[PDB]
RNA sequence: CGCUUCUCGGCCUUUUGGCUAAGAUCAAGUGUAGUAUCUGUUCAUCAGUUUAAUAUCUGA
RNA sequence: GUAUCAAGCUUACAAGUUAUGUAUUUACUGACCU
């Protein structure tokens, strides 16, 4: 995401693979972190939808509970017709606090 | 400011057609694109013509179209790769008439990239997998299957990347229930780039590579590489499995290739060329079509070189192996871009200018006559195979499909006195080039011609039966004149016929089985075979006015109105009704209509009255004589017309002025009646018969036939004159027409072309015409033809001597010396057989005078051989007299790639006496190609390239005045208003110059900020200037209010000029505009600029009147934005922004399809903006009734 | 006035501010202000801190495209080849940005390129005319 | 002309009053990524490294 | 504590100097986070 720098994406090749979202991150964009006009669904690769890995939200790896979105923000500038944008690492965030 | 694109005859030129069962039938249609237009085209085969039944707009490049057939299915869906990143699956739907999406797919970004795929595309033919391909880095599979609701599915994109290779073409391997193989052709070229030394990029050549899909694998992998010693361009599939030997072909330059892998070798045949055809001083010969076809027993393949010899490659093996290879010559045609070989004997070339054509294979095989050779039969020195073109023998010409591209040049002009303008426009390429002249009515077409003399007032049309088409009488009347001629052999007055009464006639009509009502000053007349005539009438004197005629009910009136019925009993005679209104008169005419269903009186009356006012009533038996619902009207209708045009009985009154439109319906009448206009004599609305359905003409100063074509309320007028009277015509001269003739005369005429809008004259040419201009006294064109390699006739004629000469020096002494001599004086069809080529850097070019009426060449003065013209304008000057001049810009030795010229010549010519002839007056040198002529104040401004110059007759060349060098690059156009001199860069954009009066200065004082790669322009408003590119942008550019244009003349501002100028709009059409005018289409309308594009495309652009109206189109393009995506993914706004930026332009094109739609969506746009579809469609037509055609 | 404030704060949130407003006005006729206020934007590109240049990143990837490519492209030139490195390589990547967001539509904004001694740097498609 | 006294003005503490038990009591926050700014602090001639040009090293 | 709007009660009467390195805070940003 925008919020935490060290975070990398997958970009790896799209297929038909609908994303979705947890309770806690609902209604938020992928790329910009917004929450206003939905456009375009996340279609997400074969590989970070397999096995355990279905039904998983896209950014913090929880149970998903709605679909993914894309903003319009993010289709006009076709920030959604780049690679699959499935955050992998987890790094300096979500992972001390749970040694504090 | 606020501009609106409406399109009137959209695109032409065909890049992309493919041939299959797309409706579900046993028959084969055709879906061809345009580029940007989506086309079906249907090859009905009992007439053999063309009916296009959809046409829609993708709003994108198609780059990749192709279809495939399912397995285990019956009906092909399309894939359709654009610009953009969405892949698309198509289904033909024949019901609702519409592409239905199937599936739209995201593999990347959008535009015309290298990296995305879209360029080129491959199928599997059983259906199970398609690939899509870029040029280079990566390839997209996708796997096609079916599940059980008999429904598509498709899988994720397979990835087949490889790095720094490029892709040529891509073809799919028909494999027979095996792992799918995908055949390309990449190249290599990081040693060609890492490599300074130039060497290593000539050994990089061409790999054929094999991409073979592990369906249990889920994966693409390498499995062949193999080198080519030759450099090949595409691809053809090889039909196998359980049918033969499944391969690919491999064209090249001079050759084909056969290749397939394991244990068959590289089968390879030379491509034959001509006999002593004079294009080959070192020229290789490519193919440009594959045209695969299956009949079931064998299977070949109709290829296309680019000169348009047909190759029947026919593959016969003894065993599994390859044996040979071979071909022969087919026959000739156009150059076409793609083929569609049909089922049943057809073939559809697709030109890739000019027209398109649709042959009928006649003799197919053709293993007779022709001396074939083969491939493996030891042949040397080259190919060594020669061929005679010959005519037409194989196939006949069937369909000639019109299209207006190349739109090189046009102008809007009156110069044939016409009351609407007419367009001039350039079109086709070398020899199969055509100036056409453009009208706005109908193809009618005169078949035979008689000399009725008198004032004849009518013409009416009967038959014998209701199931005949002979139609054995055709009376004409005027006051005392019965005149019922024969329709058919030897027209001549007749004798007492059988269907014949008396003299005073004045209406005829079949009512019965074959019993004839006839109206006259006696009026009733009843005659089938025996002259049943009960001629009452006499309500004591009045007997003459006001018949009206339907096929089973009558209605006729006297000086009153509401009147008499006399109608006839089904197993009787006639019979009457006592009922009367007796109507203090007010009486103008009547018209009615009938239903084909109906034991019942079963139609609606219309009477119009003399007072402001018509009136329709509904006259069964109950609720009789009893008026139903009122009227409007401002002055008087003196006509009346009502007809039911659907596959809502649509009233038509009509005023002297205008007509109206109406939607009558049975129980309840809600009219919502459309408005149109049409000296301005009283119309006459007469109701004719085309194709199967009915149709109204209204005639006035010019006629107007009113048609619907597929529920679309054509309007169009016809091509002629004032005819005063309309009326239906069936023979066997001519199946369905219309007789048409009040004024001393009588003609037989038909509607042959009656889908489109423009009529089409075209007048033949001999090279490209590069543009042209208008005498405007005694009005002819002066047209500049020029093409880049080609000769001239005095250059063919002695390169003809030459090969004569060379055939009889080589070993003369053993002789045919008929075969020189046959080769001179048989001079061939360039049109048909395909214009020679003159190597590189021959620039052939003439000049013709030509009348744009009769079409002649009036006159034509040639060139040389390195001479090309440019530029051509008539002015007149004023240091001479009133006589005319003509000042044409040669260049010489100009070759293009890479572009070094050797110096132009400016021709001067006189143009005497009224523009007849043409005499040569004196040629100046210059240094540089003169690509610009403009009139400019009694002298001539000539854009030498970086240098404008300001000239001046003299007796021995012509001398300058100035000279301005602050000018950039190269001029590629140059127009002026008065005072002011718009000079167009062939790069950057518009600059503004200043010429003075006191001195002779050409000062810059102002330009632009965009470069735009501008090549035509025009002038609207004394500030505001209108431009075009290459690449199909519209731009406006605008000055600043100040802008002084008094500037005295060395630090610029940026690197320029100082007042810079801003833009009020930019737009993206897609096609290369190549003629910008501001004109008024229609009179009584207002102005509008017409842009002509370069795939035979013609829009216009609109201005608004008010702020609501903007607002309103505004509110319908954004809701149809989100309402009705187009079909290649594409977006519109980012399509409209596909260079620059659109701004305060609205496409209406897209406006147009919301009458395209379902009326759910059509409901939840227009109760977004509150109103009505109707009413919304009714604003729409606005634009297009007033502004437009 | 944001732009014109000394911190760098007010710049990166009017930054965003500009971005949000042209993918905002996109297609609607309003590119004067947005050129204007790019003008501002642009001597911001020299910072140095990950926020300010992100946001002044997004807002030149949302500038992109409503008001062209074009204008993006000629601001870009006269700083590519610069020898000072710290301009050079955000330059270069901000043309790398531009380049994967529109491919194409940079073709037509393209300046011209002359001939060296042995290349041809010249593109001659586009130089000849009918 | 100088000296003492008085009156008027130009003005340099004015805080809401004083007293009872100073009248009696009170005032929690993190952890992550990054940046700006204060205090403290210190700045002899060739050759190449490096740098847009500059500013560390080896040399006499 | 106030500025208007009736009944309660009251006489029913008198009457023509930029800059570096670091020890080190103060602030600021990312809709950062159970
Ligand atoms: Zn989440
Ligand atoms: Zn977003
Ligand atoms: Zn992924
Ligand atoms: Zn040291």
Same mark, same amino acid.
Request: aromatic letters at 8%.
């Given at each position: 995401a925008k919020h935490h720098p060290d975070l990398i994406f997958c970009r790896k090749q799209a297929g038909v693979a609908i994303g979705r979202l947890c309770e806690k991150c609902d209604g938020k964009c992928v790329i910009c972190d917004s929450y206003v006009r939905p456009c375009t669904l996340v279609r997400i690769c074969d590989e970070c939808n397999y096995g355990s890995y279905q039904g998983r939200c896209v950014i913090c790896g929880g149970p998903g509970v709605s679909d993914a979105y894309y903003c319009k923000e993010c289709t006009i500038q076709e920030k959604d017709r780049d690679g699959c944008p499935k955050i992998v690492n987890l790094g300096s965030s979500k992972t001390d606090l749970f040694y504090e | 400011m606020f501009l609106y694109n409406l399109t009137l005859q959209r695109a032409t030129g065909i890049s992309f057609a493919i041939h299959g069962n797309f409706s579900g039938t046993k028959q084969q249609e055709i879906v061809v694109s345009r580029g940007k237009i989506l086309e079906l085209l249907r090859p009905d085969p009992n007439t053999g013509k063309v009916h296009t039944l959809l046409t829609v707009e993708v709003f994108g490049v198609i780059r990749s179209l192709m279809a495939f057939r399912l397995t285990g299915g019956t009906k092909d869906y399309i894939v359709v790769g654009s610009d953009s990143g969405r892949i698309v699956i198509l289904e033909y739907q024949p019901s609702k008439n519409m592409f239905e999406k199937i599936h739209q797919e995201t593999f990347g970004k959008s535009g015309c990239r290298r990296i995305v795929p879209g360029q080129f595309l491959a199928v599997d033919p059983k259906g199970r997998a398609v690939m899509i391909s870029a040029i280079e880095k990566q390839k997209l599979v996708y796997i096609l299957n079916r599940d059980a609701a008999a429904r598509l599915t498709i899988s994720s994109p397979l990835e087949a990347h490889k790095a720094n290779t490029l892709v040529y073409h891509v073809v799919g391997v028909d494999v027979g229930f095996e792992n799918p193989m995908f055949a390309c052709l990449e190249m290599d070229y990081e040693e060609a780039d890492n490599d300074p030394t130039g060497e290593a990029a000539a050994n990089t050549?061409?790999?054929? /590579?094999? #991409?073979?899909?592990?369906?249990?694998?889920?994966?693409?992998?390498?499995?062949?590489?193999?080198?080519?010693?030759?450099? &090949?361009?595409?691809?053809?599939?090889?039909?196998?499995?359980?049918?033969?030997?499944?391969?690919?072909?491999?064209?090249?330059?001079?050759?084909?290739? +056969?290749?397939?892998?394991?244990?068959?070798?590289?089968?390879?045949?030379?491509?034959?060329?001509?006999?002593?055809?004079?294009?080959?001083?070192?020229?290789?010969?490519?193919?440009?079509?594959?045209?695969?076809?299956?009949?079931?027993?064998?299977?070949?393949?109709?290829?296309?070189?680019?000169?348009?010899?047909?190759?029947?490659?026919?593959?016969?093996?003894?065993?599994?192996?390859?044996?040979?290879?071979?071909?022969?010559?087919?026959?000739?045609?156009?150059?076409?871009?793609?083929?569609?070989?049909?089922?049943?004997?057809?073939?559809?070339?697709?030109?890739?200018?000019? =027209?398109?054509?649709?042959?009928?294979?006649?003799?197919?095989?053709?293993?007779?006559?022709?001396?074939?050779?083969?491939?493996?039969?030891? %042949?040397?020195? &080259?190919?060594?195979?020669?061929?005679?073109?010959?005519?037409?023998?194989?196939?006949?010409?069937?369909?000639?499909?019109?299209?207006?591209?190349?739109?090189?040049?046009?102008?809007?002009?009156?110069?044939?006195?016409?009351?609407?303008?007419?367009?001039?426009?350039?079109?086709?390429?070398?020899?199969?080039?055509?100036?056409?002249?453009?009208?706005?009515?109908?193809?009618?077409?005169?078949?035979?011609?008689?000399?009725?003399?008198?004032?004849?007032?009518? @013409?009416?049309?009967?038959?014998?039966?209701?199931?005949?088409?002979?139609?054995? +009488?055709?009376?004409?009347?005027?006051?005392?004149?019965?005149?019922?001629?024969?329709?058919?052999?030897?027209?001549?007055?007749?004798?007492?016929?059988?269907?014949?009464?008396?003299?005073?006639?004045?209406?005829?009509?079949?009512?019965?089985?074959?019993? %004839?009502?006839?109206?006259?000053?006696?009026?009733?007349?009843?005659?089938?075979?025996?002259?049943?005539?009960?001629?009452?009438?006499?309500?004591?004197?009045?007997?003459?006015?006001?018949?009206?005629?339907?096929?089973?009910?009558?209605?006729?009136?006297? $000086?009153?109105?509401?009147?008499? #019925?006399?109608?006839?009993?089904?197993?009787?005679?006639?019979?009457?009704?006592?009922?009367?209104?007796?109507?203090?008169?007010?009486?103008?005419?009547?018209?009615?209509?009938?239903?084909? *269903?109906?034991?019942?009186?079963?139609?609606?009356?219309?009477?119009?009255?003399?007072?402001? $006012?018509?009136?329709?009533?509904?006259?069964?038996?109950?609720?009789?004589?009893?008026?139903?619902?009122?009227?409007?009207?401002?002055?008087?209708?003196?006509?009346?017309?009502?007809?039911?045009?659907?596959?809502?009985?649509?009233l038509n009154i009509g005023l002297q002025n205008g007509v109206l439109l109406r939607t009558v319906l049975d129980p309840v009448t809600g009219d919502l009646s459309d408005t149109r206009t049409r000296g301005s004599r009283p119309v006459k609305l007469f109701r004719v018969r085309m194709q199967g359905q009915e149709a109204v003409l209204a005639m006035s100063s010019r006629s107007w036939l009113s048609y619907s074509y597929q529920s679309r309320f054509h309007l169009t007028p016809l091509s002629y004159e004032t005819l005063e009277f309309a009326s239906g015509f069936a023979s066997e001269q001519c199946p369905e027409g219309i007789v048409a003739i009040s004024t001393n005369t009588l003609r037989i005429l038909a509607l042959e072309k009656l889908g489109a809008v423009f009529n089409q004259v075209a007048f033949p040419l001999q090279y490209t015409p590069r543009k042209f201009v208008i005498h405007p006294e005694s009005n002819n064109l002066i047209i500049i033809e020029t093409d880049?390699?080609?000769?001239?006739?005095?250059?063919?004629?002695?390169?003809?001597?030459?090969?004569?000469?060379?055939?009889?020096?080589?070993?003369?002494?053993?002789?045919?010396?008929?075969?020189?001599?046959?080769?001179?004086?048989?001079?061939?069809?360039?049109?048909?057989?395909?214009? *020679?080529?003159?190597?590189?850097?021959?620039?052939?070019?003439?000049?013709? @005078?030509? =009348?744009?009426?009769?079409?002649?060449?009036?006159?034509?003065?040639?060139?040389?051989?390195?001479?090309?013209?440019?530029?051509?304008?008539?002015?007149?000057?004023?240091?001479?007299?009133?006589?005319?001049?003509?000042?044409?810009?040669?260049?010489?030795?100009?070759?293009?790639?890479?572009?070094?010229?050797?110096?132009?010549?400016? #021709?001067?010519?006189?143009?005497?006496?009224?523009?007849?002839?043409?005499?040569?007056?004196?040629?100046?040198?210059?240094?540089?190609?003169?690509?610009?002529?403009? *009139?400019?104040?009694?002298?001539?401004?000539?854009?030498?390239?970086?240098?404008?110059? @300001?000239?001046?007759?003299?007796?021995?060349?012509?001398?300058?005045?100035?000279?301005?060098?602050?000018?950039?690059?190269?001029?590629?156009?140059?127009?002026?208003? &008065?005072?002011?001199?718009?000079?167009?860069?062939?790069?950057?954009?518009?600059?503004?110059?200043? #010429?003075?009066?006191?001195?002779?200065?050409?000062?810059?004082?102002?330009?632009? $900020?965009?470069?735009?790669?501008?090549?035509?322009?025009?002038?609207?408003?004394?500030?505001?200037?209108?431009?075009?590119?290459?690449?199909? =942008?519209?731009?406006?550019?605008?000055?600043?209010?100040?802008?002084?244009?008094?500037?005295?003349?060395?630090?610029?501002?940026?690197?320029?000029?100082?007042?810079?100028?801003?833009?009020?709009?930019?737009?993206? @059409?897609?096609?290369?505009?190549?003629?910008?005018?501001?004109? /008024?289409?229609?009179?009584?309308?207002?102005?509008?600029?017409? +842009?002509?594009?370069?795939?035979?495309?013609?829009?216009?652009?609109?201005?608004?009147?008010?702020?609501?109206?903007?607002?309103?189109?505004?509110?319908?393009?954004?809701?149809?934005?989100?309402?009705?995506?187009?079909?290649?993914?594409?977006?519109?706004?980012?399509?409209?922004?596909?260079?620059?930026?659109?701004?305060?332009?609205?496409?209406?094109?897209?406006?147009?399809?919301?009458?395209?739609?379902?009326?759910?969506?059509?409901? =939840?746009?227009?109760?977004?903006?509150?109103?009505?579809?109707?009413?919304?469609?009714?604003?729409?037509?606005?634009?297009? /009734?007033?502004?437009?055609? | 006035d944001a732009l014109m404030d000394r911190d760098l704060v007010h710049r990166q949130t009017a930054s965003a501010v500009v971005q949000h407003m042209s993918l905002g006005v996109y297609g609607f006729g309003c590119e004067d202000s947005l050129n204007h206020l790019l003008n501002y934007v642009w001597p911001n590109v020299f910072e140095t801190s990950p926020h300010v240049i992100q946001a002044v990143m997004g807002a030149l990837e949302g500038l992109r495209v409503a008001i062209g490519p074009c204008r993006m492209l000629q601001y870009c030139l006269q700083g590519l080849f610069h020898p000072a490195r710290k301009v050079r390589d955000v330059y270069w990547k901000i043309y790398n940005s531009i380049y994967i967001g529109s491919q194409d539509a940079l073709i037509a904004h393209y300046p011209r390129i002359y001939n060296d001694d042995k290349n041809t740097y010249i593109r001659y498609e586009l130089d000849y005319i009918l």
């Open positions: - | 050549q061409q790999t054929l /590579t094999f #991409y073979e899909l592990d369906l249990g694998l889920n994966h693409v992998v390498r499995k062949y590489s193999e080198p080519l010693e030759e450099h &090949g361009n595409f691809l053809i599939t090889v039909p196998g499995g359980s049918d033969g030997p499944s391969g690919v072909l491999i064209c090249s330059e001079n050759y084909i290739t +056969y290749k397939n892998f394991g244990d068959q070798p590289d089968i390879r045949c030379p491509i034959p060329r001509r006999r002593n055809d004079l294009d080959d001083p070192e020229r290789g010969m490519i193919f440009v079509c594959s045209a695969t076809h299956k009949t079931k027993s064998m299977f070949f393949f109709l290829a296309q070189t680019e000169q348009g010899d047909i190759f029947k490659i026919t593959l016969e093996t003894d065993e599994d192996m390859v044996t040979e290879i071979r071909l022969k010559y087919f026959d000739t045609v156009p150059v076409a871009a793609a083929m569609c070989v049909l089922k049943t004997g057809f073939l559809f070339v697709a030109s890739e200018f000019g =027209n398109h054509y649709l042959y009928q294979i006649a003799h197919l095989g053709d293993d007779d006559e022709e001396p074939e050779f083969s491939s493996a039969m030891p %042949l040397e020195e &080259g190919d060594t195979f020669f061929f005679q073109p010959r005519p037409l023998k194989n196939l006949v010409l069937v369909d000639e499909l019109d299209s207006l591209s190349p739109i090189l040049f046009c102008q809007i002009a009156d110069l044939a006195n016409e009351d609407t303008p007419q367009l001039y426009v350039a079109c086709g390429r070398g020899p199969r080039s055509s100036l056409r002249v453009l009208r706005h009515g109908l193809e009618v077409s005169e078949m035979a011609v008689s000399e009725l003399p008198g004032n004849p007032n009518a @013409v009416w049309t009967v038959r014998r039966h209701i199931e005949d088409e002979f139609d054995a +009488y055709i009376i004409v009347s005027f006051v005392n004149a019965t005149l019922v001629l024969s329709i058919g052999e030897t027209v001549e007055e007749v004798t007492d016929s059988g269907f014949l009464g008396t003299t005073p006639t004045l209406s005829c009509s079949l009512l019965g089985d074959d019993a %004839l009502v006839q109206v006259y000053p006696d009026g009733i007349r009843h005659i089938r075979a025996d002259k049943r005539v009960n001629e009452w009438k006499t309500p004591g004197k009045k007997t003459i006015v006001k018949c009206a005629v339907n096929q089973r009910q009558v209605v006729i009136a006297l $000086t009153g109105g509401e009147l008499v #019925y006399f109608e006839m009993d089904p197993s009787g005679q006639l019979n009457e009704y006592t009922e009367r209104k007796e109507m203090s008169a007010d009486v103008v005419c009547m018209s009615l209509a009938n239903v084909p *269903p109906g034991e019942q009186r079963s139609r609606f009356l219309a009477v119009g009255l003399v007072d402001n $006012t018509v009136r329709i009533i509904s006259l069964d038996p109950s609720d009789c004589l009893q008026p139903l619902s009122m009227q409007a009207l401002p002055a008087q209708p003196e006509s009346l017309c009502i007809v039911e045009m659907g596959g809502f009985l649509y880049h390699n080609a000769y001239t006739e005095a250059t063919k004629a002695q390169r003809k001597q030459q090969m004569a000469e060379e055939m009889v020096e080589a070993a003369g002494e053993d002789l045919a010396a008929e075969m020189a001599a046959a080769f001179l004086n048989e001079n061939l069809p360039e049109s048909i057989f395909g214009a *020679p080529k003159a190597g590189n850097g021959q620039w052939a070019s003439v000049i013709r @005078v030509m =009348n744009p009426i009769q079409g002649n060449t009036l006159d034509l003065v040639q060139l040389e051989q390195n001479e090309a013209a440019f530029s051509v304008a008539v002015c007149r000057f004023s240091n001479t007299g009133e006589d005319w001049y003509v000042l044409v810009g040669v260049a010489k030795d100009l070759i293009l790639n890479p572009r070094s010229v050797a110096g132009g010549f400016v #021709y001067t010519y006189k143009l005497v006496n009224n523009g007849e002839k043409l005499e040569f007056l004196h040629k100046t040198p210059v240094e540089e190609v003169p690509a610009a002529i403009a *009139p400019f104040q009694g002298r001539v401004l000539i854009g030498v390239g970086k240098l404008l110059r @300001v000239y001046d007759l003299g007796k021995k060349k012509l001398l300058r005045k100035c000279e301005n060098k602050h000018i950039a690059n190269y001029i590629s156009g140059i127009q002026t208003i &008065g005072h002011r001199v718009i000079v167009s860069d062939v790069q950057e954009s518009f600059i503004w110059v200043r #010429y003075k009066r006191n001195e002779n200065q050409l000062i810059i004082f102002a330009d632009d $900020t965009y470069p735009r790669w501008v090549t035509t322009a025009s002038l609207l408003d004394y500030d505001t200037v209108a431009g075009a590119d290459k690449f199909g =942008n519209i731009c406006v550019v605008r000055l600043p209010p100040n802008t002084n244009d008094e500037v005295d003349e060395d630090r610029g501002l940026l690197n320029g000029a100082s007042q810079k100028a801003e833009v009020i709009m930019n737009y993206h @059409v897609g096609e290369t505009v190549l003629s910008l005018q501001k004109t /008024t289409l229609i009179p009584g309308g207002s102005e509008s600029l017409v +842009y002509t594009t370069l795939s035979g495309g013609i829009g216009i652009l609109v201005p608004f009147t008010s702020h609501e109206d903007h607002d309103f189109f505004q509110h319908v393009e954004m809701h149809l934005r989100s309402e009705h995506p187009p079909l290649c993914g594409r977006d519109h706004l980012s399509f409209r922004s596909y260079y620059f930026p659109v701004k305060n332009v609205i496409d209406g094109d897209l406006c147009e399809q919301f009458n395209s739609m379902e009326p759910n969506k059509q409901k =939840n746009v227009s109760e977004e903006l509150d109103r009505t579809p109707p009413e919304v469609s009714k604003k729409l037509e606005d634009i297009r /009734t007033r502004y437009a055609f | -």
